[model samples]
Target chain A: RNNPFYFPSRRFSTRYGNQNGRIRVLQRFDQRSRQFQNLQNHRIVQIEAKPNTLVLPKHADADNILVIQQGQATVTVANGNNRKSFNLDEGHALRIPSGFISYILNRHDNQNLRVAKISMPVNTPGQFEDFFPASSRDQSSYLQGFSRNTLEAAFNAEFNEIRRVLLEENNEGVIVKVSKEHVEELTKHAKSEGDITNPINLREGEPDLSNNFGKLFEVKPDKKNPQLQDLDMMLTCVEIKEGALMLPHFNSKAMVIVVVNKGTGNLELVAVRKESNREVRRYTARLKEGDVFIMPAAHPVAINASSELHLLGFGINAENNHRIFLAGDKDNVIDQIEKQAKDLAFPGSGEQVEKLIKNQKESHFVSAR
Target chain B: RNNPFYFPSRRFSTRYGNQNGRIRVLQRFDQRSRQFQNLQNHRIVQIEAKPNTLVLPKHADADNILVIQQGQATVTVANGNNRKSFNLDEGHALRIPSGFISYILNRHDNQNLRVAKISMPVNTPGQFEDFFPASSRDQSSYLQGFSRNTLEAAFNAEFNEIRRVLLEENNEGVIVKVSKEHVEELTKHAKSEGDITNPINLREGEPDLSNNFGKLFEVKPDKKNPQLQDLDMMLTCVEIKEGALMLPHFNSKAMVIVVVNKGTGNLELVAVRKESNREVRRYTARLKEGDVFIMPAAHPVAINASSELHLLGFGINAENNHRIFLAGDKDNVIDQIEKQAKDLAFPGSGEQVEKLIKNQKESHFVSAR
Candidate 1:
């Protein structure tokens, strides 16, 4: 019988980019047994921006929750005739409903802004189509489809003027660098209202695991955060220094969606393939800021940062998310093997096998150097 | 980016049979990377039979290779103008091309017959439709589609005579018991040909790993076995006494296709699911003679026999297939972990932890009781 469950090896499907930054999105299919063909189609988008940059006005086909991983930003969402703005910093998260026109600006002058947005399609299951209202080199406004006479009569202006005014804008790209003065003006206007909801700072929670290699913070839904209560997911963030590696490990129950928020790194995955006749296959991908990837459950994976790296991972499971490390001082799978079996398999002396397998002392994120 | 490769969890797609015997079939899609969507649609069928049983005449949509796993049988294949018969005993295999009508009879009087057949679709990639030429109570022949006069003219006989000859058969079901004397007559004719290819007895090879728990026989393609040289798969047979388990282990490289050739047993699979937040999940299935199941790679699984159990497993890879065990004193994954890590994870003293992890002296197959 055909197994109803299928876990994709890599889930990334689409990419949107401009000069200032890029947003890579991954849409997940519903993995429930009976609903094998019914896809939840939740989108995980990784966004990166240059310091003091602005994203053009756009609307998505789904409701989105954005989590800031680095730097600071302000998001303006247009609600009917009223516009509401919110201040966002590292660890802060905010929600924007579907079809609401919104724009974001980086508040920092030197550091790049990184955010991960989770979008759940309201009507469509797996579609994340983005519509740009303003005219740009890559896309034109919907108004362009109208006849010249219709457009002129509606705007009560000449076709040339209407075209120039609607097509030409201060920002030419999806994401464009902005002057510090413009950012200050926007900040001042956002502050005057003083009616925005405070973004949730993920760092407020205690670290789940911390060591010299890095620190990990987990965020879960609870009554304290009513906005997140409806979301059936959990988020984990990790910060690792250069030359350090997150030890080889696998999650017991979660399919992990990882977003590289800062710096550059290499991700290595070890999985078995029946097509290869049950041979162990290794896959490596170089990831930088704004890159997104997925690690299926039970596959052993490791990450090494070229510089100081920050990664945000969203797990399918919200509770009891446990990670089993394969190369650490504590709770390593290797610790359960017998000495004789190890020697026989490794074709080495008992002491040599022990030394090779038990050499690592550090737990969690260990130094790769 | 999406990973281009995907390995299915379970491959069997269809089955046919009754209480006395059964035939289960698996069809595989093309496993190539570039033409991932162009499935080869090859079929792998497993057949089981009771003593003196006969399988009705039928033709498949693809070319097939049949290998007997246990007992003895005689196969009759009909060519355009010629008829050929072959005697097949344990380990004997023969090829039957597409559209050739064939029937099989178990030669033994008291033993059960087991056969594994691989079918490659001739023109179509994934279609394995079967056609029965002889009419039975459960199935009507293709002649049923034509008018009585058309059928009579085609067969050069009266309508009543054609119906009686085509519909009346000794066996009622797909598999039915036959007289011992009838089996002897077929066996005599097959032997008279004196052109049978020698079958390779798997027991002739050295045991890969053997103990009181069970014995394992590995079969791979070698220069000496020219018939298997073109095939890229491997086979392993295991025999275990009642109450003995195959150990808690996972295959490092292969997805296992298991067929229960004799006795009854239970299969336990340990895996992780996102719904359970990476917590260990256990799934158990009761299996008996003629049953088949698949174990995906990396999921720890164990089998316990009720009576003396014999299982045949087919793996995609023929070389470098490895199994990692979680239990047993020898060749266990636990032997590789440091004492400090082991103590911390298990929360015990050094000697106590070591003793607990190394307590199991028996390896491979162990006592389930």
Candidate 2:
């Protein structure tokens, strides 16, 4: 069957960028799932930046949403004659539509900035091509595709001048360090020039669901946030204290895109073989600030946080979303499993199996150091 | 979640070759399911050849099993000083291990020869590459990679002579017609030289499973079938009459590789969205002789044959294999489905649903037309 979900293995992640830190993207061209086939193309990118780093300006073939997962950063989106800049911190999500050229700068003096982005292809599914306006060490300007004379005439500049600006041997990596004060000054200047900050501050949203384990704050499209409606996407923030873990559960109606907003934690994803009814660990990753990952719909996932972790997630088909917990206070799916099937799965020791499979009295998020 | 099955849509079937006919191959590198992940690489290739045609000798990265679905053919496998030849007809299957150079010829005088092959990667999962010894219109010989002197010394032939043989402009479209007498003489010569024929004739196997819809004849590893054991694969032959359909069911433990051997038919594959319990058509293909397809494990599939259709299939994890039928005489999984869930799925049509889902009274392979 064409699966409606895709959970990539570790080897499938595509890494780009350079030395300091790289951006790793996981995308699939094989539309094995109905959901993926419907979208035509989508990608999840995990980006890590050193303190006070500046990402060169570039545009992509798809609309993108960037979620700040760690530290602080400033982003500038150039919209023709006008530019908009935003000061972003952890739990902030900013959307940049297709064809918009944008650059980002890590604004912290001592901490690295990390962000996770979800992008949907515009023309081709699973085609990820980026265009840079100015040449960099590893990338050349799109103008380089044309003859020198054509570029000169198009820009109304001399060949030498055009080459100097377009191919100027700049060796800085895609992510390079910049002065914090300079980025702060740019943010101030943009604000004075009527820059609009429209990012969703996940920290400001009230918890839509909560338990002893953690709080889940969900953001949906509202009159005040019409962009979410255009994208048909939702944002969620989860905060769990040290020694607590999110209960084993599954998203009943959404493909979850998750970013580690703060602290350190680990996630476990399970996949079951339909024929054998055998369960296997599909993915287990140690996540720190800025790490990005995916949990396909209906796949059981559990998270353990260390030193109080915060997570921000973007989801497709989030409307009427529900979590089916396998181990939670009252409504665990395991409670509905057939007794005979459960016995067959657990084998002998029925009493022990009952004790183990029973729902926990604690909340959705529980202390489980 | 990683799905254990991949039922391809009609548009996804890739076609090669030209006007005379084409070779269709369906291979998935996406690893949508855990079973697919374990193998890493697999592919199904369907080849068509006009009467008396010869396919050039080539080697591939994976071991292969070819089942002749139409007319007759001859295959020659070169193993250094030792060689093997087999005369194959409809219902016959031959194994060609990885790296073994082999060639095939259509031996029929009036009909085309059609064969479907299943191949598995040797070292890397999902890697498929072919190498031809002699250069073709679009390909170069392996020796072309070496220096002229190296080639001359290796073959102990002069440069010009080596070039004459290796670079001969053989413009055959992989499948080229040979004289009927030449092919006949070759087959007779091989037989006279003690060439042993060892192929599973599907028509001769005992029916391992049967129902009103069709009879399933299974072939597995035995002393008489050492090759099947070496490959750890199993084969099955299915015969169904016109208007009859295989009851809706799923292979509980294997990925099915199918080749239509005779007549015409169609198949319907259904995949359910785990989160929403929504049923979706994964594949619906009209099948004819020589066509090849796949049905991943756990996906519900039903077949309708016209006239008298014969199908041959290869499967991984065949041991202890079982079919979970949804509409069989007895032992249907639907019988085990919860009443409330069934009510929700059918909605106030319990009696009608029972009649529709109940098993048929006719024996397996019963006459339909």
Candidate 3:
């Protein structure tokens, strides 16, 4: 009964929350059938932190990629030997390797730091969990799981002192509100930190491609930033104009996590359904803001803007990914196939297919109106 | 340690054969990692039957699609209540559903029937096997596994009677050289049968796209032949001229089984490696005739022919699949991206990306010379 190409919405489970922030996590990818199962290594989590709040130090048994959806934050990541901190603005991203201790502080006074987290499990597989060191009345520290003697021995301190300073439970939840000056103090050493692993603003530079139809932002691990190599992923944001069409296209090697950020649009994804070859009702849907979906690697999807749509995409295993468009333009793969190949694929339709490719003037985002 | 994009050569194990014909089986897809494990449901088996030979009646707990690579055959298939027989020619394919009693006969005196079998397992998943109904001293029929009296009761006959009339293997291999006239008696009524489930020659249709560079033949599940709908599979054969390229492209839904039938060429396939994002050597290889490989779904691959080349492909889950080309021409998906998007992806290179696009005259395949 599982459809491989699409995911249903409204099942996001709200996890930890307080007056300052809350986190929402999607169901695991392996919950679906074969197509979705292929994405078991990756996980998605949404985080929202109120202004002037600090999310406590925590680490996952997986590499993490944080993409800021809105607002600004000062993020500090520490490995066993080194530490780096940076200011991350909206539409920016940074990669955190597995087991690295990290924390975030939303420094903006009126903005909520909403970020999307893409995790690739490393230490373990299947089960997904995060580890926090701080102990609380209701929340036990992962470190507390260690014996007091081990902690005292590892930190070179007496048992009581180690217990009081590191093992004692704190009343506050994982995220707690801090004073404006505290937020500023934490962010003081920001821009001086990251670049190769910088909080690169996805929407800061020129758009990946833009015309009257839309603009797109794509960030992938390249020569300058090898840190993203931890997960081999890419980030993308698209803004399409009203009545414009995002031509049918597909990615080679990347299963995409798509979250609609703004406007309403029509998404038509064509896939070889396990039972039906190609099905419509299961893959075609009206995508409005707040919608979240996963497009299995290689499924051809087309989008048409209803009222100027904006969509953000996280492609797991997307480093060096190539998006290949099928049609609606002259440079289409079909347009270039040998006339002989066309005649074979379409059966005597070479002339018409050639004519069809010739007729479309625009390539990626064609004006439907 | 394994490459996710390409399969190595010479692992095919010859399972069954005689002086007349043999079967070579490829390693199971699941042995590979997440990328290949996605193909666990389908299996590829190469079969060769000599002329004037009869492939004894057999059935499988799986749907089998046979694509003839050379020669011809008279294939008869019988379900519980209905029976159909058809003459299958070279470059043709037919689907035989699970549990159907079927057999193939190479009636021609000079030509050998060489077929590529693509099977999608049912009844069980993971393991791939075929069931033979006849029994011999060394080879026992699946039915023989049953108690002799139970078999007799099912047939309403004595055990000895059932064993002699229905289960005897007659001391011959699965494929046996029959008298030329005996082959005639088996294929006598072939032409009068088959339609929606016919042996349609894949190459009979006009070229899907053809030019001086090459010819391509693609056959997937469609309205006229609903049989292929059973497995959502497709068969393709391509012929490229010397010095021609099969543009860098990818299939969104189908993992392809590629077999080189003639000539030599270079195949450059790019993919996101689990540990390294993208890696070479593991994917780029020189391919010669008789080489067999599997291309994981969605990996961008480009092929260049050093000599006139012929290749056969079996796309599991290929029904309604799309092959999208990335570049080398105007109709490319990149060619259509907005200039803003281009600048974003390439970083301040929109003008050059545009000039680069404007400069190329071809769409799919360009003359590197």
DockQ of each: 0.01, 0.01, 0.01
lDDT at residue A367 of model 2 (Cα atoms): 87
Please identify model 3 stretches exceeding 4 Å from their true place. A1-42, A45-369, B1-9, B192-196, B276-282, B317-320, B366-369
Q: Write the per-residue lDDT of candidate 3 for residues B119-185, one digit (tens) a residue.
A: 7788666566667888743357898788977897899899888888877776657777798678778
- Summarize candidate 1's per-residue lDDT along B108-150 as a digit string, tens digits: 8888887887675532354444554444444444334344533
Candidate 1's DockQ:
0.01
Worst 10 residues of 2 chain B by lDDT: B272-281
lDDT per residue as tens, model 2, B191-296:
3122223566876656876665567888776666767766666888888867666655556445566767688876666543322111232456678665656665
Q: Compared with the true structure, what per-residue lDDT tens digits does model 3 show for residues A129-166?
A: 45544454324444343334333323334556545544
Ranking by TM-score: 3, 2, 1
The native-contact fractions of the candidates, in order shown, are: 0.00, 0.00, 0.00
Q: Give residue A219's lDDT in candidate 2 (0 to 100).
A: 79
Candidate 1 residue-wise lDDT at B274: 69
Off by over 4 Å in 1: A1-53, A78-84, A110-114, A118-126, A132-182, A189-198, A221-229, A317-319, A334-359, B1-369
Error of 2 at B83 (Å): 0.7
